[PDB]
């Protein structure tokens, strides 16, 4: 049961890191495009 | 026991990815601000 609870919590952690990576990808893409346009 | 050891190691991996995401967030923010200031 502790292991099940650990995996559950770790899945939440993973989802948070996915959110973060998606945010950063959009932001760096926006910067790359800004520099290209300039 | 193998599963416990796997979860332990995976938690270390997750912590490393969190470190990396935090580094990248600060770096892209620094770049965004640099461009704004310029």
């Amino acid at each position: 049961n502790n292991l099940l609870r650990a995996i559950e919590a770790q899945q939440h952690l993973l989802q948070l890191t996915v959110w973060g990576i998606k945010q950063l990808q959009a932001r760096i893409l926006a910067v790359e495009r800004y520099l290209k346009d300039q | 026991n193998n599963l416990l050891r796997a979860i332990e190691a995976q938690q270390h991996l997750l912590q490393l990815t969190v470190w990396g995401i935090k580094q990248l967030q600060a770096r892209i923010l620094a770049v965004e601000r640099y461009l704004k200031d310029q």
């Binding site: 502790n2 609870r5 650990a6 919590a9 770790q10 952690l13 | 416990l4 979860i7 332990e8 938690q11």
Partner: peptide, 28 residues
């Protein structure tokens, strides 16, 4: 949605602390 980087930090830390406890309790 409502997610901000400070909230992200908070939630990461809370889940990490819980997992540490769960893994340790299992050590026992």
């Amino acid at each position: 949605n409502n997610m901000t980087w400070m909230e992200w930090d908070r939630e990461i830390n809370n889940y990490t602390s819980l997992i540490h406890s769960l893994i340790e309790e299992s050590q026992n």
